[PDB]
């Protein structure tokens, strides 16, 4: 509720520094990483 | 600097309850009143 240009951008950036969806995507990939490491180690161990 | 309807009216009314010009007009007429009273009393005293 204002007429000042640029207030919307600043206030939105302050309210939500990082969107929830991106945080959850990062969490999912990071949590799945160790299984990938184990799988590639197993593949390396053979041939 | 706002988008709220009616904020301009309220804020202007609070800033300037009475305009200067109207106060000065009232002052001029009120200050001139006693001379009018004296003149009309003089007119009445004759005829």
From Swiss-Prot, chains A, B:
Tissue: Highly expressed in neurons.
Top-level taxonomic group: Eukaryota
Record-annotated membrane-spanning stretches: 21-43
Side Extracellular, residues: 1-20
Subcellular location, record wording: Cell membrane; Cell junction, Gap junction
Leader sequence segment: none
Assembly behavior: A connexon is composed of a hexamer of connexins.
Function according to Swiss-Prot or TrEMBL: One gap junction consists of a cluster of closely packed pairs of transmembrane channels, the connexons, through which materials of low MW diffuse from one cell to a neighboring cell.
Family of the protein in this entry: Belongs to the connexin family. Delta-type subfamily.
Name of the protein in question: Gap junction delta-2 protein
Record organism: Homo sapiens (Human)
Lineage start: Eukaryota, Metazoa, Chordata, Craniata, Vertebrata
